[PDB]
Amino acid sequence: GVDYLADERKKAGFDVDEMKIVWAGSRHDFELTDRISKLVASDPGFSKEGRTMLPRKELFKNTLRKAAYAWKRIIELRLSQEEATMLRRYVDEPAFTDLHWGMFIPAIKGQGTDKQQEKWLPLAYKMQIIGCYAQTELGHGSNVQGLETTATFDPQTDEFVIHSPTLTSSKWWPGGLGKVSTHAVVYARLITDGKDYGVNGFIVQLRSLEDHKPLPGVTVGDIGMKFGNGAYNSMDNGVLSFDHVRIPRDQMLMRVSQVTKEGKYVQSDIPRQLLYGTMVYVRQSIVADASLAMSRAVCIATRYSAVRRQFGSQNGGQETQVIDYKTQQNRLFPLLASAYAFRFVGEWLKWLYTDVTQRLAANDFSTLPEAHACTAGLKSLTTSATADGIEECRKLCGGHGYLCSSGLPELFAVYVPACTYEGDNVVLQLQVARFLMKTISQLGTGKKPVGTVSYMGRIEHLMQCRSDVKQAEDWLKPSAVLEAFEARSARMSVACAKNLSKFENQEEGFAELAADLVEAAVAHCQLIVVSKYIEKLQQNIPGKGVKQQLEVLCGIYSLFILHKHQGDFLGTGYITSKQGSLANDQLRALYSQLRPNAVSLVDAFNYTDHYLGSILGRYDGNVYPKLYEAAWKDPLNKSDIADGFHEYIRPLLKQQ
Amino acid sequence: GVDYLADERKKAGFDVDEMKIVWAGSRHDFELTDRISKLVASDPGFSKEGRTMLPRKELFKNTLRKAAYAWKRIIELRLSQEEATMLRRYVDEPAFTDLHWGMFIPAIKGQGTDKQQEKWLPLAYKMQIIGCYAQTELGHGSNVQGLETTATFDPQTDEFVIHSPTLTSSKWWPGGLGKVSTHAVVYARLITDGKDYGVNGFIVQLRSLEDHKPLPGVTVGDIGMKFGNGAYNSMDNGVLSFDHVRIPRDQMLMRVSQVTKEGKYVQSDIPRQLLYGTMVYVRQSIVADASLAMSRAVCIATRYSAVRRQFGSQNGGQETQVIDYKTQQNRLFPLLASAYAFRFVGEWLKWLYTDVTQRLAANDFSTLPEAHACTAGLKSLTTSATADGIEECRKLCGGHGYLCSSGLPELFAVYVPACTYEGDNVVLQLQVARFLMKTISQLGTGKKPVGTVSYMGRIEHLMQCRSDVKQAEDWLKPSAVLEAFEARSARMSVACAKNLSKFENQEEGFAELAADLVEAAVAHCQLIVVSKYIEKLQQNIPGKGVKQQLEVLCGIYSLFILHKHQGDFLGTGYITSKQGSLANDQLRALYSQLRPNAVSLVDAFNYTDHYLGSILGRYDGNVYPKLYEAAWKDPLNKSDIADGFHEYIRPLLK
């Protein structure tokens, strides 16, 4: 087996082994990714062969099998929980285990009392119970405060009654609930003392532990097929309705709020703000996965673009690899750039998480709004860019990209729910907006802004500066780009606050000015990404030519963005046409330098073929023969005559 | 029997029946769509229940049966060609019949001598053969001049020998090829008399008519599974490979090029320019289909946005329909304006086809390079926007949009190939760019330009003019928007062209400025759309409030694009910030007007629930109970214990 990309690899002008380390985040991280990776990859029992053609029932049985087998490797190899996270990542199949570890345990941890965690967590850690997280209902997803499921305390019996008063209050979506889960944390409105104390979490057992039949009064099942072959279809997303299901009182999560023997709401010390610590963690984790999906898609389109030649024969010559084209470059390299950018904004959130929970331990709350907005904005930004980027990578692969065996169709189907869970992307950006608008109106009060909105403390200036770019290369110097993003955002937010303040009723004004508020929120998020990329570049970072390439990636991301939203900077006045053109010319230059390195830079993600499952992105570039061999395995190819043909088509050929 | 959307219907400020007419295109068009669609929709044999969950063997079987049942009704009802195309559209199921009618017949027709169309077309017209169109190879899609499949004439035997020299010469993608077609038009390099004469089409029998087994030399099958549940997996896209298959001399389509007994090449002396069939008609068709897909998505998402409520309870009241939100509006309404806009260009394209086939049949080839780019650029534009709006429409439906049974996942998976077949979108827009660059660099002559580039007969003016919008409503006036877009296109092209003349060789320069060129191409295309819209509004349009509703959508479309590409209006100097904002304020106002009509505007597409196959988009707005009943039909709900459980999960628990 030759490496048909050995020539593209040679052309690299940096140390891939160190790039690997940068992508991974640390030597520890890389060591762990690499060993768990290859260990998932070279094990018969984790094969994805055939997965896309299974009917839902065998797909699902097959998920269960892999789910069990993986648990068994976690045990037999004494992997830590960190390691087990990795192991499941590389198995690469949505399944209940994702929610049990991913949401059910974190909910108990964050919201159960000391006692509650002692009781429920050992069970969940050994999977003597399997739990999911039931919040969304038919009729409520984003608006959590409006859920209809009720939990009504019963003083006569020391139980809550969980009830679904209506069809639409039915739970709908929660993964692992359809078929697998034995228990759920069920969010419902607490009704006690004939008053509504709002939404809380209840640990409700859904099925008998002996035979897995649903308990009395509980109705549970799966909701239906979702988008794509395989994808989330291996996940049992559930509908769940309750008919006065009775639960003991100490099954309410009582960390923050509790209910006495007699009813009556009570509140502990231990601040409800403690929970904002878990926002940051989850959002971080989701931004991390954005860099993961973007990197997988970019890795396939890139390798495919180096191998795919089309046009540009010159006399008898080989045709031009499509990656040599500047239009292929203009759609592809910003996505590459984005994977490294979102990778780094990912690390910066790791830090932001440590900072917030350092402050949470001093009962320091001055930093929380900013932390919340910063994470909402970043989750939104990165999950759109990524969803849009994977469709773009498919398109960049031309017709072959439409084939399941290319890897991109699944990767898009699986990825896209990111845009709606743990916050609708657009709904999160109106939150970002409100906070910027808030941050602007507190200036009058003399309240000086911090973290990621510390730039808004310098508006007088940002309102009136002009870029001073004289040559394309100046767009390379960080202070030029950073200021350019700061100005844009300040100006856009200012323009919103001015526009907004003409409304007597502020709620009216948020409604009417929503589209622009979002446009402002986007600009701010973009600024966070760029400014963190620049911050990253001031770290050391070993390995020959590594930093240098990462600078190239920086420029591309921020200048791609600058061109896309070019009106934003020309509006306000911050840059002139010539200057916009100079940025355009420098992005063009940057594409030409990235070119030799694209394949090496996606080689840096260190993915196996098993994990990638793309014939178009095979490491060795042996694409076409693989696609040919692959077609000869579709069900239709079992014979030269399709079932149906003699019955329906033959008669008509001859007429009958 | 209750319509949850009546309160929205009653808010209409226009005659829906007459908007229906407009959408369809004429009372004749309308009476025809309406009768054939109810026909399909109300016939159990065209049901789509359960499709999406079928394994592939069974989905294919069921395709073959629908196809045959379709042919049986076309015949029993004495349907014409136009009605038959209609019927096949409302069956809503990609199938071989679509290449046979859509590409095999029109290629013979187009590229064959009269003598040849006389022996083949009757055969294909009664479906006594089943043809597909085999151009694309593993290694060559866009680049038709580099297909590797060869066609060597054997003088010693009066035959061409069609051969697949290499694995990557394998024919790959043609639908109807993989299992059903008995013949193909196979495109191959003509090797004759020792010289290579480029691509040509050859009628080749793929399979024994008596028993359907492949003929000696031929290798065919399906290529595998494609994006999305159902969608195109009901189509057998093929791979076909040849070991020197033999074929009579009269199976080369000998209309434009001929080959004589003794070998050797003669040309008909009948201008290969006649192939507007090959372009304007087909691209016309893809553009029409873009409006068709955009309108389905926008229809599901408008209805769903008027049913779904979330937030906005003030004192324990009802939550706000999401359709009242400015962000929903700004994501949804330009999509709705686009369907109407792309619908109207599509009309204008019929005109162009009739104008071009009048001219071609006559003696005038001059209008032709314009007709070519114009249509290329529109295929590109409308398909890109449509594939985007469909994904955007799914996002508009929130979590519920992720379910197959919202209708949207399929609609996206089956539409999106449009961006790649008959011309890759960016490749197509690189061609508009050449034509524009050509149109400039020719101006210094004398011979002023025409059609969709006559605006470049006035570059001098548009190189210097500047907007005089003094308030928001000014952007309503047709002259301001047109001039806004002509100024924009003219400037971008001039800038590209100026930038390019700086190169020693034009090819290197073209390679290098490619993104700026495409960017300029898209601008030229937006102008076309916008200006055909304006012209549409010069027409008699009957019915109360129809024309105003259309004016509103027209503004929406132009100003949404205006805001999105505001850099291009601002940077060239055309407008000032204030004017820019004024454009943004007017767009708001427009959303607010469109609001009460949004649901009636999509009612005017007149789609049945059967066609639309979306619970979220049900005419009657009864969404949630219907989702809930759908869930129970999934095979996982066939019992309470999943297969898998006791074998794998029970021991893990205990």
Ligand SMILES: Cc1cc2nc3c(=O)[nH]c(=O)nc-3n(C[C@H](O)[C@H](O)[C@H](O)COP(=O)(O)OP(=O)(O)OC[C@H]3O[C@@H](n4cnc5c(N)ncnc54)[C@H](O)[C@@H]3O)c2cc1C
């Ligand atoms: C694959 C998948 C897995 C999931 N798994 C789980 C799970 O395990 N547990 C669980 O509890 N849930 C789960 N969910 C539910 C999910 O977490 C989200 O809560 C759900 O997708 C929220 O979407 P929605 O339908 O309510 O969007 P909506 O909020 O109803 O939004 C609908 C549309 O209206 C717009 N809109 C809504 N509000 C506003 C506003 N105020 N202003 C402007 N526009 C607005 C939105 O932008 C969107 O366009 C899952 C969902 C999916 C898709």
Ligand SMILES: Cc1cc2nc3c(=O)[nH]c(=O)nc-3n(C[C@H](O)[C@H](O)[C@H](O)COP(=O)(O)OP(=O)(O)OC[C@H]3O[C@@H](n4cnc5c(N)ncnc54)[C@H](O)[C@@H]3O)c2cc1C
């Ligand atoms: C569903 C489907 C059905 C099809 N059915 C048929 C059929 O029935 N019959 C048939 O003959 N064919 C068929 N095809 C083939 C199809 O019509 C196209 O011709 C083919 O998909 C063209 O794309 P490609 O794969 O050649 O992309 P390529 O041209 O290889 O492009 C790959 C990438 O390279 C880029 N690129 C290529 N050239 C340039 C350039 N010069 N400048 C800048 N960028 C460039 C493209 O933009 C794209 O990003 C079908 C394809 C699909 C997806």
